[PDB]
Symmetry: D2
Subunit: 243 residues, 4 copies
């Protein structure tokens, strides 16, 4: 139960992001989901209704980051739960990877984690309680051909979280990572029927995971039932990989 808790879920327009936003809201938290346009920010506001609000945010723009937080402190208050789910992909074999494809992935997938975590830390420490959860990926752990940039960022955010976790552990703040395997979303519904089959062959469970399933893991970690879990990575991949 997250009654009275304020959660900021970056990139909450669809799939995992949205399921996270809706699940936290359904369990009592005032949720602020974000998108990169006024349109998307509105759509989020529409589905969250009176439970939260949608705000436009660019996780790579320091200005956008403080601006968004300011509003939040004004209309709702200090952020208690941060869920870093904003991220993108710029797949390509190393040989064909453009410098911009590397830099954007790093800036958006990794650096974003540092900026936002840093931006909500002070308030959490004062209250001596908080939750920071970043949506990683099984790729950050096993790596994947054609995704060296994506993998670097996903692996990197775990290294980041482990270190931050050690800095604020005693202050009642946990920093964890939920690593999804293949989840049914846009990026999987737009794959040919053959690619889809190729994907399922790697998953012992024999089915793609659900966005909601990733949301359930986040909610658990964001709750008070997971206060002794920090610096940990929770893999939700149907057995695709086991650590």
């Amino acid at each position: 139960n997250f009654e009275g808790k304020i959660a900021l879920v970056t990139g909450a327009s669809r799939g995992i992001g949205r399921a996270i936003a809706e699940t936290l809201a359904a369990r009592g938290a005032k949720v602020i989901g974000t998108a990169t346009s006024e349109n998307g920010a509105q759509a989020i506001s529409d589905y969250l209704g009176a439970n939260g609000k949608g705000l436009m945010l660019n996780v790579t723009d320091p200005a956008s980051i403080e601006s968004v937080l300011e509003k939040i402190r004004a209309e709702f208050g200090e952020v208690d739960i941060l869920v870093n789910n904003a991220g993108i992909t710029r797949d390509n074999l190393l040989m064909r990877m453009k410098d911009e494809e590397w830099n954007d992935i790093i800036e958006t997938n990794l650096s974003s984690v540092f900026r936002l975590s840093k931006a909500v830390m002070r308030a959490m420490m004062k209250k001596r309680h908080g939750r920071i959860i970043t949506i990683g990926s099984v790729v950050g752990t096993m790596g994947n051909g054609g995704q060296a940039n994506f993998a670097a960022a996903k692996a990197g955010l775990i290294g980041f979280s482990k270190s931050l976790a050690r800095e604020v552990a005693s202050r009642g703040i946990t920093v964890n990572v939920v690593a999804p395997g293949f989840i049914e979303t846009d990026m999987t519904r737009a794959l040919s029927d053959d690619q889809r089959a190729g994907i399922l062959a790697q998953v012992p469970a024999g089915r793609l995971g659900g966005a909601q399933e990733i949301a359930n893991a986040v909610a658990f970690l964001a709750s008070d039932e997971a206060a002794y879990i920090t610096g940990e990575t929770l893999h939700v991949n149907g057995g695709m990989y086991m650590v």
Copy 2:
């Protein structure tokens, strides 16, 4: 909420074992906790009340295993959730470790996992649904001086679970491990303040974990909210170790 689910929690006399038994019961499951003595069984039966029953079980005795399950199928039904929490410790530096101290730890901490998991598998596969959760230990992952035997068994049960997970993943059955760090028990409660400070010194969180906190992790994994998590190890150690 495990409405209509039957859970068998081995070694449910106290601490982690008991908290697991009570938490599953509080959330709607009919729980069967076990002990080595008729006393314990009865004590377990008293605290579980109408939610479950206590039965005497020796996880190293094939006969006892058969027998206990038999009594469960007769009075309650097929086991849906298995929680392997029975285990012991026979600490000693390798050079002073007795052969019996190695064999007992292996028989009770590792082999037990094979015997019980195997014993509840068929019914689970038929129902095309099930949960197997073993209580490991952070020691299984980082190892520990004077606990080579304990460490072998805890590390070993993860290897076991990973393999079993791959065998029954497609059948709607997950096999996971929850690895506790230092948890407040009767052993630690009776330690001197200096001894306790030497343990706390290792935990970034700055406190021992709570038996209930381990119970919460198990409940999450045992629920339908964790259907896409299998072959995974969930570390609940306050940051003592991060993988």
Copy 3:
């Protein structure tokens, strides 16, 4: 260069075991390879020639273990390098796994590591120098359907080594594990041309590893060039798995 060093390589009749025995011998060590029969022990003596000797050993028989070591101390001296490579497989889905198939794998693959390591420890500690290397398997880390017993033992020996490593680290003794992926041996040359292809599909390198390649890793770890490596697991699997 292992001039003046004595190495005991268990199960050195073929493949990995033999390549290890020959490589250590070629680099100056007096090698004692073992087998389960007088015949095999002789064959080993024949290929090692003046570099070592073959002895009959049963890693599950405490009597055989001290008996073999005694001779070694009599004809060569104290063991400086221990390479646990003896091991077997009793594959079967959990449902069809016989109690004897579980017990034998554990006794031969895991318990053996404890008995032999314990048996050569005293001398190593006195000399304040030594090397203990156990041949694990990628299966101990990722697990594998139909090999729950094998996986438990391989995972378990890592837990064991980590703990032992912590006990003797300061005494100039390292305890490590080399985890091979699919290696060309009898157990792979006796697979149908289809199973072989299935195996290669999992290996980025696109070829089975060589017994000699596993031997090279062991030699490195057994040398003085790896004195700061302990409690570590070296994966040699062509990219089949990455940790």
Copy 4:
């Protein structure tokens, strides 16, 4: 023995970098060590003598990267072995970490790995053989208070290497990481005995590691004796951490 092999070791002015440069050179490779200043290049050239040359390089400057490689193809030839050892530290608790301290660490410690690996790939793929080794850190795996930026980059380069490894594995090219623990450098040599005791307290081996010891691990991985090792991380930390 790298007879006829060309190795490029970034940041080879001292410690680990230098030991790597000298060890590869001593074993027959023509080595090109790099520094940020013309001084360093020359100093490197002096100690390498006729075995190699020193060149000024800035791993964050695409121009410098191009340029340096250009000079190497002209005077020596295509790079066969790449050792990414250039890196820096900008320690600080998250709340006091400057944006420049995050960006510089990422640009220099992580992005550099992408730029240089990409820059030597084509020739390696053509030769259907190559070695890429990056010097990580135990911090990338366990994280560390006050080093969130360093940790992110070190963890990130592993994710990168794993993915690249999968892309070029079949082409006879391995991509690995050597993760040193506490290594005796000019920073530690100048610490007070109490500060040194606080580090030694963490190392089971009971001493700092030697720069040469890290060099030995790299040489092993760079040799033909490690052709079946890729996407792997080799921990050389005296037991400070065990994975």
